Design a protein around this motif. Structure first.
Motif, PDB file in Angstrom:
ATOM      1  N   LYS A 187      45.309 144.063  19.146  1.00  0.00           N
ATOM      2  CA  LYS A 187      45.162 145.211  20.049  1.00  0.00           C
ATOM      3  C   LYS A 187      46.128 145.637  20.831  1.00  0.00           C
ATOM      4  O   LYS A 187      46.254 147.109  21.058  1.00  0.00           O
ATOM      5  N   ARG A 229      41.105 135.940  20.650  1.00  0.00           N
ATOM      6  CA  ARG A 229      41.341 137.122  21.419  1.00  0.00           C
ATOM      7  C   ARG A 229      42.709 136.888  21.944  1.00  0.00           C
ATOM      8  O   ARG A 229      43.477 137.584  22.422  1.00  0.00           O
ATOM      9  N   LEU A 271      34.845 144.194  16.722  1.00  0.00           N
ATOM     10  CA  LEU A 271      35.169 142.756  16.667  1.00  0.00           C
ATOM     11  C   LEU A 271      35.458 142.091  18.248  1.00  0.00           C
ATOM     12  O   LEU A 271      35.412 140.802  18.210  1.00  0.00           O
ATOM     13  N   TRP A 272      36.212 142.868  18.754  1.00  0.00           N
ATOM     14  CA  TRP A 272      36.807 142.102  20.161  1.00  0.00           C
ATOM     15  C   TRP A 272      35.543 141.646  21.024  1.00  0.00           C
ATOM     16  O   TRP A 272      35.673 140.608  21.746  1.00  0.00           O
ATOM     17  N   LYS A 273      34.554 142.355  20.860  1.00  0.00           N
ATOM     18  CA  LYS A 273      33.246 142.119  21.774  1.00  0.00           C
ATOM     19  C   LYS A 273      32.128 141.131  21.061  1.00  0.00           C
ATOM     20  O   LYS A 273      31.420 140.752  21.853  1.00  0.00           O
ATOM     21  N   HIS A 274      32.517 140.789  19.905  1.00  0.00           N
ATOM     22  CA  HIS A 274      31.548 139.993  19.099  1.00  0.00           C
ATOM     23  C   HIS A 274      31.483 138.353  19.921  1.00  0.00           C
ATOM     24  O   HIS A 274      32.563 137.997  20.616  1.00  0.00           O
ATOM     25  N   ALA A 290      34.094 136.169  19.015  1.00  0.00           N
ATOM     26  CA  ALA A 290      35.510 136.741  18.946  1.00  0.00           C
ATOM     27  C   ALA A 290      36.430 135.865  19.857  1.00  0.00           C
ATOM     28  O   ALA A 290      37.454 136.007  19.563  1.00  0.00           O
ATOM     29  N   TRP A 291      35.866 135.127  20.855  1.00  0.00           N
ATOM     30  CA  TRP A 291      36.681 134.469  21.792  1.00  0.00           C
ATOM     31  C   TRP A 291      37.868 133.558  21.402  1.00  0.00           C
ATOM     32  O   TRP A 291      38.621 133.497  22.027  1.00  0.00           O
ATOM     33  N   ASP A 331      46.585 136.995  16.185  1.00  0.00           N
ATOM     34  CA  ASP A 331      45.424 136.983  16.972  1.00  0.00           C
ATOM     35  C   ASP A 331      45.107 138.467  17.208  1.00  0.00           C
ATOM     36  O   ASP A 331      45.591 139.424  17.156  1.00  0.00           O
ATOM     37  N   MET A 332      43.852 138.682  17.912  1.00  0.00           N
ATOM     38  CA  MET A 332      43.246 140.092  17.943  1.00  0.00           C
ATOM     39  C   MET A 332      44.084 140.613  19.297  1.00  0.00           C
ATOM     40  O   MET A 332      44.166 141.644  19.205  1.00  0.00           O
ATOM     41  N   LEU A 348      33.163 137.268  11.432  1.00  0.00           N
ATOM     42  CA  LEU A 348      34.309 138.491  12.061  1.00  0.00           C
ATOM     43  C   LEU A 348      34.943 139.075  10.756  1.00  0.00           C
ATOM     44  O   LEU A 348      35.072 140.532  10.752  1.00  0.00           O
TER      45      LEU A 348
END
Ligand SMILES: CCOc1cc(C(=O)N2CCC(N3CCN(C)CC3)CC2)ccc1Nc1ncc2c(n1)N(C1CCCC1)c1ccccc1C(=O)N2C
Length: 108
Positions: A52, A25, A15-18, A21-22, A47-48, A94
């Protein structure tokens, strides 16, 4: 646990790199976005970046809590925005990846 390890190294890694995703994040910045009602409507921001960080610091006690943080982030997006906003569609893409990866998480 094996499940939290999976959520960190499989689900969040995907998910983070999609490309979508921006916006997720880091926390919604209601001030920079000109949204004086965001925190009146959204009582639990998520939020991610927060998720994380929680995974890196072994904050969670159960995979279901991390899953709830992901879910809250997506639901916040669906509840605050308008049905036709692009951000809702990004959240849906996502969230579909989130659910697809969660379907293969190790049991505990
Ligand atoms: C950390 C900031 O990230 C964002 C960035 C930008 C951005 O484009 N520039 C463009 C150019 C950037 N340069 C380029 C040159 N260089 C030298 C320096 C850097 C500077 C920033 C826009 C929105 C953001 N942040 C956001 N975070 C959550 C949400 C969110 N936007 N949107 C979405 C609307 C469409 C996509 C994102 C929302 C908007 C309204 C209400 C709710 C929500 C919402 O629900 N979420 C979750």
């Amino acid at each position: 646990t094996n499940q939290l390890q999976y959520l960190h190294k499989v689900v969040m890694k995907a998910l983070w790199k999609h490309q979508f995703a921006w916006p997720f994040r880091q926390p919604v910045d209601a001030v920079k976005l000109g949204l004086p009602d965001y925190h009146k409507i959204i009582k639990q921001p998520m939020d991610m970046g927060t998720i994380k960080r929680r995974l890196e610091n072994n904050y969670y006690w159960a995979a279901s809590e991390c899953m709830q943080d992901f879910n809250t982030m997506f639901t916040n997006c669906y509840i605050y925005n308008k049905p036709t906003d692009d951000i809702v569609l990004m959240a849906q893409t996502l969230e579909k990846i989130f659910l697809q990866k969660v379907a293969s998480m190790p049991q505990e």
